[PDB]
Amino acid sequence: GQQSYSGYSQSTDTSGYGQSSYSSYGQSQNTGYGTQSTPQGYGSTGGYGSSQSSQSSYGQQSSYPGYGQQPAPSSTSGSYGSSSQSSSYGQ
Amino acid sequence: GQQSYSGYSQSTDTSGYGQSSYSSYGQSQNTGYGTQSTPQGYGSTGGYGSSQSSQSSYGQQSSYPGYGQQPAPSSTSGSYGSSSQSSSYGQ
Amino acid sequence: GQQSYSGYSQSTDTSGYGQSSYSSYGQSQNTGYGTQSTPQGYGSTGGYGSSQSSQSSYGQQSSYPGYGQQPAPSSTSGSYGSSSQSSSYGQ
């Protein structure tokens, strides 16, 4: 008799007068006997994320965003962590 | 009889008057007898992240973002940690 | 009888009047008898991260972002740690 048991991951409890905050980005579980395949590319506040993959192929992949671009004077802001804080100015 | 048991990772409890904050980016588990494959490329606040892979392939992969780009005078901020704090000015 | 038991990694408790903060980037677990392969490339605040891989392949991989680029006078900031604090000016 076999067993795997990946249960209860990233859970959370609370009692009394407890406060909590939780933020998650991009979990991927695999249990038992199967196959899984998930590439990921993220980009934030002006960065570039990329990811490529191939299994038993013959083809041709090629990627090139943002080619020769020219945006204008901006003022951006972003907050991703839990209970964080962010700010942005310009003159 | 065999057994694996990777349960309860990245959990969280709380009692009394206790506070918490949690941030996760990019977890990936594998348990038992299967295969898994997850490339990842991230980018932030003006950086570049890249990742490639291949298994038994024959083709050609190619990547080149941001070619000759020219942005303009900006003012960017960003906070990703728990209870972080960020600021940004321009003159 | 065999056993692996990688449980409870990166957990957290709290009682009384306790405070806590937690940040995680890029964990990876492989328990039992399986295969796993996850390359990662990260970039931040004007850097470059890259990563490549291959298993039994025949092909050609080539990477070259940021080719000949010319951004403009910027003023960025970023806080990634727990209870960090960042700031940025320009004149």
Which residues on B lie below 8 Å from C17 (Cβ)? 16-18
Q: Is A48 on the interface with C (CB under 8 A)?
A: yes
Give the contacts of C4 (CB within 8 A, at least 6 positions apart).
B3, B4, B5, B6, C31, C32
For B61, half-sphere exposure in the C-beta direction (CA atoms, 13 angstrom radius) is: 22
What is chain B's length?
91
Counting every residue, how long is chain A? 91
Looking at the complex, report in whole angstroms how far the Cα of residue A90 sits from the nearest Cα belonging to chain C. Answer: 10
The torsion defined by the Cα of B9, B14, B18 and B19, in degrees rounded to 10, comes to 50
- Determine contact, residues A46/B64, Cβ cutoff 8 Å: no
d(CA A71, CA B73): 9
Burial B49-74 (b: 16+ CB within 10 A, else e): bbbbbbbebebbbbbbbbbebebeeb
> Residue C7: enclosing H or E segment and its boundaries?
none
- Quote the CA–CA distance of A36 and A58 in Å, as a whole number: 21
Question: Could you give the C-alpha distances from C50 to A9, B8, C19, C45, in angstroms and in order?
Answer: 30, 32, 37, 15
What Å distances lie between residue C80 and B22, B25, C10, C47, CA to CA? 13, 12, 18, 15
Nearest CA in chain C to B37: C37
Closest CB to A51: pick one of B40, B73, B90: B40
Q: Is B58 in contact with C58 (CB distance < 8 Å)?
A: yes
Q: Which of C32, C34, C65 sits opposite A48 (nearest CB)?
A: C65
Maximum alpha-carbon separation in chain A: 69
Angle at B7 between CA B3 and CA B11, to 5 degrees: 165
The chains found to touch C (3+ Cβ pairs under 8 angstroms) are A, B
| B10 closest CA partner among B1, B18, B25, B2 | B25
Both tokens of residue A10?
Answer: 């990233």
Altogether, the residues listed in chain C come to a count of 91
CB contact under 8 A, C24 and B25: yes
Tokens (6 digits) for B10: 């990245």
Task: Measure Cα distances from A8 to B16, B28, C8, C82 in Å.
Answer: 23, 14, 10, 25
**Radius of gyration of chain B, Cα coordinates, nearest whole angstrom:** 21
The coordinates were experimentally obtained by cryo-EM
